[PDB]
Amino acid sequence: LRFGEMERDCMIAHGAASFLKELMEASDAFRVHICGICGLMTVIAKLNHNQFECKGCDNKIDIYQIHIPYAAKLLFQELMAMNITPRLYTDRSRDF
């Protein structure tokens, strides 16, 4: 089925970042992990022994889970490969 412009425009509205990248429940939808430090997909989630890590920004404690449209994940990964960093943060610090 289709998840086009309009259905995207709503997910952006909803502010449902991850689901977009993954509009969602009926198309993409994907569950990725992040570092609460460096907002990337780096994280090495072993959903079993709960181990989580993220060497580099080195973590194990501060880690999130977000739902985003796979396409979006890919949007990001593709960006990173072009050396650009898309940071995913779960809290607003800039106010307003």
Partner: protein, 177 residues
Amino acid sequence: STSTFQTRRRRLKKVEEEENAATLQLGQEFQLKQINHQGEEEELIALNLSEARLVIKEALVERRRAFKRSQKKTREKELESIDVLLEQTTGGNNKDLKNTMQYLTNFSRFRDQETVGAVIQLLKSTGLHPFEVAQLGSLACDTADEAKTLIPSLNNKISDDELERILKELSNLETLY
């Protein structure tokens, strides 16, 4: 890792990483013009031993305190008095800190946050760079040579005479034992 106050826009070609030496050229992460969290500029932070001993102590202590605000619901003498402060507010696997407190407390040269205070109020009139205004504070020195040699970054930034008065007033303030 533990990120560091400035995002140096790395454009693919990461090559130039200079030498580390007493030419006062320290890793990019230690220029004298670094950035504070508030978003301001601030001189580097040069700690001379026995000044560090106090700052580490200071927190390790005010830690024990706020570590109980929530539980309601003479040389050798300091070796014991600290091991405790640790076995209380330390990771207990910070064998590094243990070893840093010994060293930091054995080779220290001041016991009064008042004595160390003058040390600072003194050298900080030089215009000298922080790494010097540190090596000077934690290194014994009788002659300008023992100094201007074990701290070559000085060589021309100060007359032998002056650097010598300061050295005089150092061993004068140098708390006893």
